[PDB]
Amino acid sequence: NASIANDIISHRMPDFDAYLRAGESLDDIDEYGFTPLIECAITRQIKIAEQLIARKVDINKPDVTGRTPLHWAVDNNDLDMTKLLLTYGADPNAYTRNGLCVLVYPVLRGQDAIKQLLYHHGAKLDFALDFINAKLIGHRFELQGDVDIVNAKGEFIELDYEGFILEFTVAVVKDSLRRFISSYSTRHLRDYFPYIHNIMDAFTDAAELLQYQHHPRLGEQHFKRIAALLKAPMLILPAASRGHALCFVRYHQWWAKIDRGENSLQEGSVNIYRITRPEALTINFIHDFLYKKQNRRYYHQMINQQLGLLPFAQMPISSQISGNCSWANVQAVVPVAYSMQELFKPDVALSLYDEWVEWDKDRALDECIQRFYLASPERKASIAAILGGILFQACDHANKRHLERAEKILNILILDEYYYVLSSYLEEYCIKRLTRKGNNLLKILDDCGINPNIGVNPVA
Numbered sequence: 001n002a003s004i005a006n007d008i009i010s011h012r013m014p015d016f017d018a019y020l021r022a023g024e025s026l027d028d029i030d031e032y033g034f035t036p037l038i039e040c041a042i043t044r045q046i047k048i049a050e051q052l053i054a055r056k057v058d059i060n061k062p063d064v065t066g067r068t069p070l071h072w073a074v075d076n077n078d079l080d081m082t083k084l085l086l087t088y089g090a091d092p093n094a095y096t097r098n099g100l101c102v103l104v105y106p107v108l109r110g111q112d113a114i115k116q117l118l119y120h121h122g123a124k125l126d127f128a129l130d131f132i133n134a135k136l137i138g139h140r141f142e143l144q145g146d147v148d149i150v151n152a153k154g155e156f157i158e159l160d161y162e163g164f165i166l167e168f169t170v171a172v173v174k175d176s177l178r179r180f181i182s183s184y185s186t187r188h189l190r191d192y193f194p195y196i197h198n199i200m201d202a203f204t205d206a207a208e209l210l211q212y213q214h215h216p217r218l219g220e221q222h223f224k225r226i227a228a229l230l231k232a233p234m235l236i237l238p239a240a241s242r243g244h245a246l247c248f249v250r251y252h253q254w255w256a257k258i259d260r261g262e263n264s265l266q267e268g269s270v271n272i273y274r275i276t277r278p279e280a281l282t283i284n285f286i287h288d289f290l291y292k293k294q295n296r297r298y299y300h301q302m303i304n305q306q307l308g309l310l311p312f313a314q315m316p317i318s319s320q321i322s323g324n325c326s327w328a329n330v331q332a333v334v335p336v337a338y339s340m341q342e343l344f345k346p347d348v349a350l351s352l353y354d355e356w357v358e359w360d361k362d363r364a365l366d367e368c369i370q371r372f373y374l375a376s377p378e379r380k381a382s383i384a385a386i387l388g389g390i391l392f393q394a395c396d397h398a399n400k401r402h403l404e405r406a407e408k409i410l411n412i413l414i415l416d417e418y419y420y421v422l423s424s425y426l427e428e429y430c431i432k433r434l435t436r437k438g439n440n441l442l443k444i445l446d447d448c449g450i451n452p453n454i455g456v457n458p459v460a
Helices: 004-009 016-021 036-043 046-054 069-075 079-087 104-109 112-120 125-140 166-180 184-214 220-229 283-290 296-307 326-331 333-342 346-372 377-394 400-413 420-431 436-447
Strands: 146-150 156-160 234-241 244-251 254-258 270-275 309-315
Touching: 004 036, 036 046, 036 069, 036 079, 046 079, 069 079, 069 104, 079 112, 104 112, 104 125, 104 166, 125 146, 125 156, 125 166, 125 346, 125 377, 146 377, 166 184, 166 234, 166 326, 166 333, 166 346, 184 220, 184 234, 184 283, 184 333, 184 346, 220 283, 234 283, 234 296, 234 333, 244 326, 244 333, 254 333, 270 296, 270 333, 283 296, 296 309, 309 333, 309 346, 326 333, 333 346, 346 377, 346 400, 377 400, 377 420, 377 436, 400 436, 420 436
Parallel strands: none
Antiparallel strands: 146 156, 234 244, 244 254, 254 270, 270 309
């Protein structure tokens, strides 16, 4: 074709004057959904970006998802492009449509240089930390609905507990594993740490392979990278099908499909096959798998025939029929990849999975509790809302661990300045009508030595 986007992708300096005479604006959204500056950021082309900035393009204009050019430069860990953008007015606290600010991914990936560069130009870390913690809590505790967090301007923005973000999920799962094997309370699991390490490695590669999905036109270097990763011992392939993320794991001659949703009613959650035609696992296979649009028939039948997937084993992973199973599908990668490395004993893998999940629940809760006492009034209100959501939705009065979490939470929700949270709940689920969860909340309050003085009593 003939396009400024195709010029940028092909590393050719565009003839900006010819495109302007043709009636185009250098801020226009191109055929790939991006602006010329966002194309420069994606392709790490700093000279073309300098040219565009010289022609006074909107340096903060995002794509439909809300990713500003600074978002794209930072997600690439490109220090020069990030510095160029920040020099000419890129908002360091811009957030995407889901509320994901510029700092989130560098925080999750431990990229200290770009984090300090963003700090120097005004980025606020609390926004990223609160977003990460709220999303992790909504996923781990299976919370429903929304909650309001505080942006870098002290204003409340909505956050969807149920919204699934794939790259965010991969990053947060890798970081959670890193924190898990580094906790004192998990030293008795030291012998299991090497295998986990490998899993983390795979997750890293997965992140890379996912980022290339945003590129408008993959080239020689992307295919060289895919060829390099096809030689890695372990491979994690998340696939999008029917609005859900299902997961595949390759480890040497073994292949594994993880789908805890509707399909698990027919197949079970986790199936492990032997790859009898490894010669079909090529660059073109990975491209069809990750970078072309495929239907359910491709992921549930075509790949079995192409790779010659011989059924070998299965894992009794619990189904997730209600809601969105993408998060659970990504979580289940850890025990499945562990078991595949063991090659067969799902016992240790499932026990490790349960221990990791419960530890991460308690870690996120402790993060919230610790940040409450150091927080501003608005962030305190947000954290109190999150804790009340945890208490009301995820704590059963017959579970002693849930009761310990409820004690932790009620230490904060009983303060006079925040009791209103509990008040609201008891107003909307105990006085107006006695729901099941309102009854459970009354029971929990009584088992912690708390009389709400509301006129309603539990019904055992």
